[PDB]
Write an enzyme that holds these catalytic residues in place. Structure first.
Site, PDB file in Angstrom:
ATOM      1  N   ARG B  19       0.871  -1.168   0.000  1.00 46.74           N
ATOM      2  CA  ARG B  19       0.000   0.000   0.000  1.00 46.74           C
ATOM      3  C   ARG B  19       0.911   1.222   0.000  1.00 46.74           C
ATOM      4  N   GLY B  20       0.752   2.051  -1.018  1.00 42.32           N
ATOM      5  CA  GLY B  20       1.531   3.270  -1.188  1.00 42.32           C
ATOM      6  C   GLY B  20       0.663   4.471  -1.471  1.00 42.32           C
ATOM      7  N   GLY B  23      -1.429   4.113  -4.685  1.00 41.04           N
ATOM      8  CA  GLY B  23      -2.506   3.152  -4.509  1.00 41.04           C
ATOM      9  C   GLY B  23      -2.042   1.835  -3.932  1.00 41.04           C
ATOM     10  N   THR B  24      -2.938   0.844  -3.947  1.00 38.89           N
ATOM     11  CA  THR B  24      -2.635  -0.500  -3.457  1.00 38.89           C
ATOM     12  C   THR B  24      -2.134  -1.368  -4.624  1.00 38.89           C
ATOM     13  OG1 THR B  24      -4.243  -0.144  -1.718  1.00 38.89           O
ATOM     14  CG2 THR B  24      -3.553  -2.416  -2.046  1.00 38.89           C
ATOM     15  N   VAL B  25      -1.091  -2.162  -4.380  1.00 41.48           N
ATOM     16  CA  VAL B  25      -0.539  -3.047  -5.391  1.00 41.48           C
ATOM     17  C   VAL B  25      -0.762  -4.498  -4.948  1.00 41.48           C
ATOM     18  CG1 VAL B  25       1.642  -3.783  -6.516  1.00 41.48           C
ATOM     19  CG2 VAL B  25       1.008  -1.364  -6.472  1.00 41.48           C
ATOM     20  N   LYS B  40      -2.417  -2.415  -9.909  1.00 43.17           N
ATOM     21  CA  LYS B  40      -2.362  -1.239  -9.059  1.00 43.17           C
ATOM     22  C   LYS B  40      -3.759  -0.611  -8.986  1.00 43.17           C
ATOM     23  CE  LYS B  40       0.246   2.895  -9.421  1.00 43.17           C
ATOM     24  NZ  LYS B  40       1.609   3.490  -9.400  1.00 43.17           N
ATOM     25  N   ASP B 129      10.705  10.920  -9.091  1.00 41.62           N
ATOM     26  CA  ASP B 129      10.536  10.217  -7.809  1.00 41.62           C
ATOM     27  C   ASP B 129      11.355   8.899  -7.824  1.00 41.62           C
ATOM     28  OD1 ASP B 129       9.579   9.696  -5.080  1.00 41.62           O
ATOM     29  OD2 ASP B 129       7.761   8.709  -5.874  1.00 41.62           O
TER      30      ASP B 129
HETATM   31  C1  LIG Z   1       6.608  -5.714  -1.506  1.00 43.29           C
HETATM   32  S1  LIG Z   1       6.841  -4.976  -3.111  1.00 43.29           S
HETATM   33  O1  LIG Z   1       5.692  -4.144  -3.430  1.00 43.29           O
HETATM   34  O2  LIG Z   1       8.141  -4.328  -3.195  1.00 43.29           O
HETATM   35  C2  LIG Z   1       6.821  -6.367  -4.226  1.00 43.29           C
HETATM   36  C3  LIG Z   1       7.178  -7.622  -3.772  1.00 43.29           C
HETATM   37  C4  LIG Z   1       7.161  -8.691  -4.642  1.00 43.29           C
HETATM   38  C5  LIG Z   1       6.786  -8.503  -5.955  1.00 43.29           C
HETATM   39  C6  LIG Z   1       6.426  -7.253  -6.419  1.00 43.29           C
HETATM   40  N1  LIG Z   1       6.058  -7.166  -7.770  1.00 43.29           N
HETATM   41  C7  LIG Z   1       5.676  -6.078  -8.509  1.00 43.29           C
HETATM   42  N2  LIG Z   1       5.481  -6.320  -9.819  1.00 43.29           N
HETATM   43  C8  LIG Z   1       5.105  -5.282 -10.571  1.00 43.29           C
HETATM   44  C9  LIG Z   1       4.925  -4.019 -10.068  1.00 43.29           C
HETATM   45  C10 LIG Z   1       5.144  -3.867  -8.713  1.00 43.29           C
HETATM   46  C11 LIG Z   1       5.014  -2.570  -8.012  1.00 43.29           C
HETATM   47  S2  LIG Z   1       5.714  -2.506  -6.440  1.00 43.29           S
HETATM   48  C12 LIG Z   1       5.269  -0.870  -6.290  1.00 43.29           C
HETATM   49  N3  LIG Z   1       5.567  -0.180  -5.182  1.00 43.29           N
HETATM   50  C13 LIG Z   1       5.662   1.293  -5.267  1.00 43.29           C
HETATM   51  C14 LIG Z   1       7.017   1.798  -4.835  1.00 43.29           C
HETATM   52  O3  LIG Z   1       7.280   1.310  -3.516  1.00 43.29           O
HETATM   53  C15 LIG Z   1       7.463  -0.105  -3.556  1.00 43.29           C
HETATM   54  C16 LIG Z   1       6.226  -0.828  -4.039  1.00 43.29           C
HETATM   55  N4  LIG Z   1       4.634  -0.389  -7.320  1.00 43.29           N
HETATM   56  C17 LIG Z   1       4.481  -1.333  -8.309  1.00 43.29           C
HETATM   57  C18 LIG Z   1       3.766  -0.833  -9.513  1.00 43.29           C
HETATM   58  C19 LIG Z   1       2.697  -1.507 -10.083  1.00 43.29           C
HETATM   59  C20 LIG Z   1       2.051  -0.998 -11.196  1.00 43.29           C
HETATM   60  C21 LIG Z   1       2.472   0.194 -11.748  1.00 43.29           C
HETATM   61  C22 LIG Z   1       3.542   0.861 -11.170  1.00 43.29           C
HETATM   62  N5  LIG Z   1       4.050   2.096 -11.665  1.00 43.29           N
HETATM   63  S3  LIG Z   1       3.279   3.141 -12.633  1.00 43.29           S
HETATM   64  O4  LIG Z   1       1.900   3.150 -12.186  1.00 43.29           O
HETATM   65  O5  LIG Z   1       4.050   4.368 -12.617  1.00 43.29           O
HETATM   66  C23 LIG Z   1       3.405   2.494 -14.285  1.00 43.29           C
HETATM   67  C24 LIG Z   1       2.274   2.282 -15.070  1.00 43.29           C
HETATM   68  F1  LIG Z   1       1.057   2.568 -14.582  1.00 43.29           F
HETATM   69  C25 LIG Z   1       2.367   1.783 -16.353  1.00 43.29           C
HETATM   70  C26 LIG Z   1       3.608   1.481 -16.881  1.00 43.29           C
HETATM   71  C27 LIG Z   1       4.748   1.682 -16.126  1.00 43.29           C
HETATM   72  C28 LIG Z   1       4.632   2.182 -14.848  1.00 43.29           C
HETATM   73  F2  LIG Z   1       5.727   2.381 -14.108  1.00 43.29           F
HETATM   74  C29 LIG Z   1       4.181   0.357 -10.064  1.00 43.29           C
HETATM   75  N6  LIG Z   1       5.521  -4.885  -7.921  1.00 43.29           N
HETATM   76  C30 LIG Z   1       6.446  -6.179  -5.547  1.00 43.29           C
END
Ligand SMILES: CS(=O)(=O)c1cccc(Nc2nccc(-c3sc(N4CCOCC4)nc3-c3cccc(NS(=O)(=O)c4c(F)cccc4F)c3)n2)c1
Ligand SMILES: CS(=O)(=O)c1cccc(Nc2nccc(-c3sc(N4CCOCC4)nc3-c3cccc(NS(=O)(=O)c4c(F)cccc4F)c3)n2)c1
Lengths: 255, 274
Positions: B19-20, B23-25, B40, B129
């Site tokens: 949770r950031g 939003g929630t992932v 997300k 960021d």
């Molecule tokens: C515990 S953890 O969250 O670090 C973790 C543990 C194990 C596995 C994963 N896997 C994973 N896989 C894909 C994405 C992500 C995360 S983790 C995260 N967190 C945020 C930062 O702090 C750590 C967790 N944010 C994402 C994330 C997911 C979707 C989108 C984005 N970024 S974005 O929205 O800017 C985006 C788009 F919408 C479209 C294309 C590119 C793009 F970058 C991020 N995590 C994760």
């Protein structure tokens, strides 16, 4: 929006392979500082920016006429299977990951709107990235063509069943058949690459299940052939039997 | 160039990741694609942002796989990165006691290759960021940059962004400052400004001129190319934005350092974590 790359940005150009579809060459993008691949000889290019998935070759841009994609350092599945001197050992975990990833890529294509069918699947165009992950590309040979093709959602599964046979045997299908018209005649008659212990040894993990997948995939009657969904449902339990480290150890063994 | 619409019900085995602010992932599996994805959980503003990010077609940028356009929720579906973030690799010293230099340098070269590509887009895509939490790691520990800056840590922020406006948000030299702190953190496996008790206190020290400690206890002498590395770090985390290099000059500097490492050493480094 698909980016536009100007031909002068593609330095160190070197021909990779030719073809009817177009000539393919490697190159290094001057601004990106990475190896790419360019295919000389626009509407279907955007259709291929829609074909965006982990097991489909990623398109990086357009040359205004060439298509810029990522460079697959490890070439094709054909090279891996048949260059037995460069690669004497190709462990089962990797062969099964390749087969899994081919089915995933094809399944994604078939799941689009409209369903995009490859209709030219062959080991030559199953590309291999730096980690030996599959990227499907290239949307002369007939060993992968279904008999009824001598417009069908049951074409790619036939090609997939032949590729599977090849991956598991490391044999060239219809090895003893020089004339391609003699292959075409044996296939029209329901004859297929041989299944026995010499081609498919008993040491193959999940041998019986793979055989039944191959045999159903290359069935004479298109309607008796599985969807990529049924075929992926059959593969998921097989792949679960391999620990993650075994795939990594399989790749390091190739390097 | 189309971005598909994903029905939320097509997403099976949903499990919370983090949770950031954004939003929630969660990690799910697409029932049709038969692959794990990351969703997300966050209308016309969002679909435009998604298409801006959808333009980024590069190996070291997290791929967007589709948008979840439900009347209840709004989600972004991307590839699932199974090894989490650079932060967990760097600081979970129990799970990862040894993180070999070839992998560390491969990560920095890919972070730099990722950011350079974004800065080369038309119009340029600036992250603003960058942090070790949003540099994600794939199955073979290759980098994917995520979480673009459209309650978090201040430790990667250049002092001139502290009080933001027109100039600070349109600044080219923001991303390189964050890169120098990530680089420093990567080679050290140390929490920047660890000793400092207040993040506000960190903000004062930085604005004055202080940086995380470039010494022997933090950066050992055994560090490959310790010299050119320490040079690059200091140059990138300069108080004067003008004194900071481009990501291209940063890559040119890095490339020979990478040629030093044989291909197999990266594979060995991974087997060691796994
Ligand atoms: C515990 S953890 O969250 O670090 C973790 C543990 C194990 C596995 C994963 N896997 C994973 N896989 C894909 C994405 C992500 C995360 S983790 C995260 N967190 C945020 C930062 O702090 C750590 C967790 N944010 C994402 C994330 C997911 C979707 C989108 C984005 N970024 S974005 O929205 O800017 C985006 C788009 F919408 C479209 C294309 C590119 C793009 F970058 C991020 N995590 C994760
Ligand atoms: C000797 S080799 O050609 O087997 C070889 C050896 C070593 C390295 C490589 N690397 C490589 N890297 C990227 C692409 C390619 C090849 S190889 C090939 N040959 C094809 C025929 O058999 C010989 C290999 N076709 C390509 C290729 C290049 C660009 C596009 C496509 N296919 S596509 O047009 O359908 C396409 C797009 F245009 C855009 C997005 C996806 C997509 F699939 C293929 N090869 C290669």
């Amino acid at each position: 929006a698909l980016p536009t790359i100007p031909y002068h940005k593609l330095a160190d150009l070197r021909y990779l392979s030719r073809g009817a579809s177009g000539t393919v060459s490697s190159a290094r993008h001057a601004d990106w500082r990475v190896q790419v691949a360019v295919k000389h000889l626009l509407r279907e290019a955007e259709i291929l920016h829609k074909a965006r998935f982990s097991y489909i070759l990623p398109i990086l841009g357009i040359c205004n006429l060439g298509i810029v994609t990522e460079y697959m350092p490890n070439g094709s599945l054909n090279e891996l299977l048949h260059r037995k001197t460069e690669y004497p050992d190709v462990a089962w975990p990797l062969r099964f990951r390749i087969l899994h990833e081919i089915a995933l890529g094809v399944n994604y294509l078939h799941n689009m709107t409209p369903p995009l069918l490859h209709h030219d699947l062959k080991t030559q165009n199953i590309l291999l990235d730096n980690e030996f992950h599959v990227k499907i590309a290239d949307f002369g040979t007939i060993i992968y063509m279904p008999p009824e093709n001598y417009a069908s959602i049951k074409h790619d599964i036939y090609s997939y069943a032949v590729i599977t046979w090849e991956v598991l045997s490391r044999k060239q299908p219809f090895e003893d058949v020089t004339n391609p018209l003699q292959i075409m005649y044996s296939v029209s008659q329901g004859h297929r690459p041989v299944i026995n212990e010499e081609s498919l040894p008993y040491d193959i993990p999940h041998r019986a299940r793979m055989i039944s997948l191959i045999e159903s995939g290359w069935a004479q009657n298109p309607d008796e052939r599985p969807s990529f969904l049924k075929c992926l449902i059959e593969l998921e339990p097989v792949l679960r039997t391999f620990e993650e480290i075994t795939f990594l150890e399989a790749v390091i063994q190739l390097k």
